[PDB]
Amino acid sequence: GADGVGNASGNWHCDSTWLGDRVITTSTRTWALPTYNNHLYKQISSASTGASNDNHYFGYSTPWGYFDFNRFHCHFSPRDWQRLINNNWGFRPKRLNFKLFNIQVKEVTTNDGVTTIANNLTSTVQVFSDSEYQLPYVLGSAHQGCLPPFPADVFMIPQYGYLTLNNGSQAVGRSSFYCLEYFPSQMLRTGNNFTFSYTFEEVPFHSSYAHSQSLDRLMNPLIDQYLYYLNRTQNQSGSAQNKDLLFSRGSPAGMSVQPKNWLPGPCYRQQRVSKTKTDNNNSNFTWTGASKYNLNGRESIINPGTAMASHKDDEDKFFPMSGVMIFGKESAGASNTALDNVMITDEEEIKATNPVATERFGTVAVNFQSSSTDPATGDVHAMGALPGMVWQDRDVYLQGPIWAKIPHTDGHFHPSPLMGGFGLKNPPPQILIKNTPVPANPPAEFSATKFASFITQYSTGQVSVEIEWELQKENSKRWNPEVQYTSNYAKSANVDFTVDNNGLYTEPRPIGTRYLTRPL
Amino acid sequence: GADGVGNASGNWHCDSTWLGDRVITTSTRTWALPTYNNHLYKQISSASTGASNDNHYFGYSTPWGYFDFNRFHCHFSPRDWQRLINNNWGFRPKRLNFKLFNIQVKEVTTNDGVTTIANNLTSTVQVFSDSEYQLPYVLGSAHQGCLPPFPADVFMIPQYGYLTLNNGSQAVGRSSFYCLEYFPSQMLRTGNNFTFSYTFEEVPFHSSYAHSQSLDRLMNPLIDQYLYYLNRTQNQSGSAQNKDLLFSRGSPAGMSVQPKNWLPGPCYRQQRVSKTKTDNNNSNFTWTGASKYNLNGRESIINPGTAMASHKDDEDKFFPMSGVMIFGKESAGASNTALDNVMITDEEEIKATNPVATERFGTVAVNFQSSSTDPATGDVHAMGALPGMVWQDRDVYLQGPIWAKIPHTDGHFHPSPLMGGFGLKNPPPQILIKNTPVPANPPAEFSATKFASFITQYSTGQVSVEIEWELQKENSKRWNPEVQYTSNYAKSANVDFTVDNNGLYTEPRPIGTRYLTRPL
Amino acid sequence: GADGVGNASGNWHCDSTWLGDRVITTSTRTWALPTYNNHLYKQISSASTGASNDNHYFGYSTPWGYFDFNRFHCHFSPRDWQRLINNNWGFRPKRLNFKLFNIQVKEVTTNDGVTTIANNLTSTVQVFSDSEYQLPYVLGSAHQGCLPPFPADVFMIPQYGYLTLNNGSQAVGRSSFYCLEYFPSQMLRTGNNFTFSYTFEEVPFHSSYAHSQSLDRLMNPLIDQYLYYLNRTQNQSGSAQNKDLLFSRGSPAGMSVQPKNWLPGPCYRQQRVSKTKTDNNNSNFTWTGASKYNLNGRESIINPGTAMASHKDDEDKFFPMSGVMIFGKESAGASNTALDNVMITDEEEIKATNPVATERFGTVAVNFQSSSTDPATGDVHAMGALPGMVWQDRDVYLQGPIWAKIPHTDGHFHPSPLMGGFGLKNPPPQILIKNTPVPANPPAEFSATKFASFITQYSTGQVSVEIEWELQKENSKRWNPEVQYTSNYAKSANVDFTVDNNGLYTEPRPIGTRYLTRPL
Ligand SMILES: Nc1ncnc2[nH]cnc12
Ligand SMILES: Nc1ncnc2[nH]cnc12
Ligand SMILES: Nc1ncnc2[nH]cnc12
């Protein structure tokens, strides 16, 4: 860093600047970091517990905390998101600037049942960015502890832990252990500060638009095709039914039978469930009726799974059991909370190109028809990629994640993070931070045994993240007005995206980005 | 070439040089080339024979031989492979240098029942590289006849033959015939030599590592998600069972139900068979229970097929019927040999990302549940590519192939050779070689009829291949030690990868490359 | 020194960098230093005690602490050690850089109960390196208190004390007393830091290899010698036994009787003891059956003593009573702990050249044979250096010492530290450190009586040691694969060289360096 006890090492830079094709978000917050695990690394696992085989794990927990800004509301105020989404066909991150500063380390002494805090001026906090990605990448799993949406909220830094290979609750020889200290890290006293910058790789702009055409309506509703298709295998009222081969040319009255160039996207069917409970089966079918994948004898719910439309027209009451992103309200309990404490996303806009999530992809022949054998077909519920398929990826949300690390594998296929966002080979590095252990008084006589008595402390300061975002401007010739995200004009007891009478900021709904429209 | 009867046209260059990010393998061997087909091109096919429709073919056999180094042990000694695999996250070929030399053509005369060999000094051997790929590409089908693993072994050059279109055992008008002479070729007497170089296209480094995380364990086992999922469709001990909609947030106790970004790789299920025969069905089900593809009314076993893990945890006794590479021991007979004369590979390391080969990919919804209709799901056994899938390709082995030509098609999809290795648009060219016909004595009076009487001969010499390989160095922060390929320290009658008391080199096991670990 | 209360004077530099022929280890840790002896130097000795004459001593204890990094795990993580040992025939230290910084001095006050710690900002810690070696050299006696293996562990600094001449528990006129203050030292307040560098003398690379030949198997196993040896002193079935002189030439069937050039190493026999207690004698024979040296009427166990192989082939259950380095587990008690709380090294690799530790060196003639007198021979249990002897020094271990000061004597003989490592004429200097006394309040009236009332304090900070190591690369033409140190692939409850569920780092075995092989 820096300088004095008596001298701030950073100012408060929270702002938005719009500049034609760029928008620069700056956000600064005040954090608090406790001591974790008493400065220990612990082995952790599902041993005992009583966990099922699909829940076993092995890993470690760490004395470190970390910074996480991997949520859009860490950077975009509600109004800015609104600006973003109502005027642009897309956007992407380009560069970032990160700042830790104004650090202040404090000691806690308890006597009684009356707790005193003071400054420990000569104490440090340690920091580093894992810029060579040598640590297990724990961002992009949508874990809580990101910078809060509301700039006035103070936040506690999450603790870093990670998993490795496990065979049940045991480890394997291949399992990996990381000690964080065995990086180089920067050591900061109250005077000092930390900074680094980062550039994002080139990535496709996120599609902030719905289509205003669908795959099956790309033709000109005024002209025939020059192409023919088999229309009838029997006449044709000449009594009664006689084998025939009758061919018709593509025609505006038969848009369902016209040859075309393209196929809709992939499909992994999911179970349709209603918001009115009375429609559903009387059982507990989530695990048992769930779409799951099977990995080394362990089952995992596919969630949210392939980008698919949530419901066809007029059926907004249904949703895939595990195919929509779902946010909790600020009233929601951790487990088995009710419908009205959650907010379910809707990905209905993609039904122009993407199969609906709770229906078949389609139908396939399954035999050879003949006079003796009747033509049979079967339903296709899971369809991989076929040449000619086109699709739309899952939408992002003001409160969803931004990016994830693409796994380091021989093979990916369209590695856009299924929960939504940008896939990055070389994503924003993890930023780790810890209070340096400060021994309590040692004995008068040497002892070799692990030092286990420490002065209790924690730290606080500010953090600042600045991101530059490039915009894809809208160039639309559409004559009529667009759907636009808008707040509600009718009167009410509270304003949306505001604090209440107890000062609790709330986000009353998810907001996606798909309001403007393109042609296909 | 060159020069004298009395003057070598090449030396013996067999070596290894390690140079930081590069390793240069040189190997030289001594070959023998007979006269094939008596200098004739023969039409060949399955006519007569009694072959089934799935085995019919049409093609030609050729008077030529060819060189084949498309196996790792043609270049890497066992110790070098060990060096490779224990210290690098990857590697790829960059360039090659090829050399034919010290040629010596010999005539064989038999009188009795006592066979005399002498030098035929004025005789040639012919050579060319098919550098414009004008010939059917016969490398990359894993045919025997490559340079031997052991530098002291002499090898016989394989004969070139190829196939074309066939309708049963007949040909079609579209079928193609190639005459090799109707290239330009180099003609070598005992003095001369042949050389050429080649550069490899840019290709992804082969992944010589296992992952130490799995797709389903990428989260931080310490923090909840901000995302919610439908947890129950009924309460919840309020008696008895009542329709409900209950939502929970992602949590470390429920890692199987957390939303995620990624899907595991593709899947084409295969039949699971045990190494202890008593477990299996009492029938012959290989063709009949086999995963097969169907091409122009002809069936073909998919083998090895999609890259998939061989068995889940603790089940090393099972293997896909035709989903693992299998090497023969030097005791193995050509057909119906026993389990202990073969070596079956294990691709278990990829179960972090790739479905296990003998299980479903997963489960899919197949109907609409309601009070009247119970939720149904189905098993998915063959799953194509879905956006968001990530996977690991099949491993290579010290004795497996290196590369294959990607077919010249409009479309490939991840054209990594399914048997393992590097796909190359423009692979190392085939190198063809033949002894020039040397007429026996003609008659005293002209005759127009095909010349059919030849002096019997063959040739021998050395061949040298030098390849430069680029290495991907390991940069791992892992605190604990790695699994490392190691020879066995316990005492025995023979050393691994050695010759025995009769001078037979043996390779006692396959060695893959996946020992070091990455994060995902 | 520089600057501020508010300003870190050092960062955290813990890392490893591999660069071809060099590897640079950096390690940084956080220490704690109490006040020792209440700022007093005390005379100490075995007086009273009840000590045997063998355990009498005289010396002094000091108010100072010291830094000790003389253990390989202070610098090499387990993975790095693995890298070291599996790829290099040797290595040596070249240069070092040392850093003390971020110091923070604290005062402790108690009422009862209850104990209060604050910063004492104007307090100093003192430091110096004994670079002219003017102090008794107390490193290289394998003391505990070195930097901990695990970078996250905080450590207490050991106290400096030393011994001098003693006659029983009394001193002699020749006994030396040393006052540490009498040395210039650097005085550091919370702002300041200490640094120095050092270069190592030229030393032989440590042998990180086993031989793959033995002294007695160097001959060509195909060819006779031209040399002859007396084979028989009687015939030879011509009945019955008659005096004769019969000579044979060296031959592959008689490799035990072939003339040779070399002798195996020196020998000081030690008592063989089994790991299965039932094999041993029923008595307490360690002191009484021990190999001891006798110095000024005082006995001392020779331990570990001459470099000798721990056991011959197939006898891994025996070990020299005091001829192997033995590490304690983190469960081991200080005294009379059980077999399974210790880890015994094995120096079996050196049996190619070095006598086995529990057997005779060999046999010697002891008389003149004649018709009247039968040839006699005797066993040699202690053999000094003979021209022509060759030997291998004791191995080093990841947790053993690195170096020791060669005593300043007229004569050494192969002064490689018998406990293992590098002998250094001018070793890394001792680094001494102390909290400066801070008087409590004096009386209002002068008193000359030596001050004795002090404010209670201690200090803490970071220390950093960087060492450059030169590597001897492996150049082996060995065709088959090597033994390699490897972690175990089978599954278990804990990972090797990791922390457990209480955060205790453990080292589950010793690791030597001898895996690669040389010829002799
Ligand atoms: N969002 C995304 N990030 C990186 N690569 C992609 N390829 C397709 N979509 C992508
Ligand atoms: N091994 C490989 N060779 C060429 N192209 C590839 N694309 C993906 N894997 C490949
Ligand atoms: N390790 C060592 N250090 C210094 N001198 C030696 N002489 C023989 N071995 C030695």
Ligand SMILES: Nc1ccnc(=O)[nH]1
């Ligand atoms: N990864 C991809 C494959 C095919 N098309 C895409 O847009 N992306």
Ligand SMILES: Nc1ccnc(=O)[nH]1
């Ligand atoms: N061919 C490929 C398609 C998608 N992803 C890959 O890695 N390769």
Ligand SMILES: Nc1ccnc(=O)[nH]1
């Ligand atoms: N000549 C010597 C041999 C060994 N050591 C010595 O100091 N001198």
Ligand SMILES: Nc1ccnc(=O)[nH]1
């Ligand atoms: N000290 C020594 C004497 C003789 N030879 C050695 O290598 N060392």
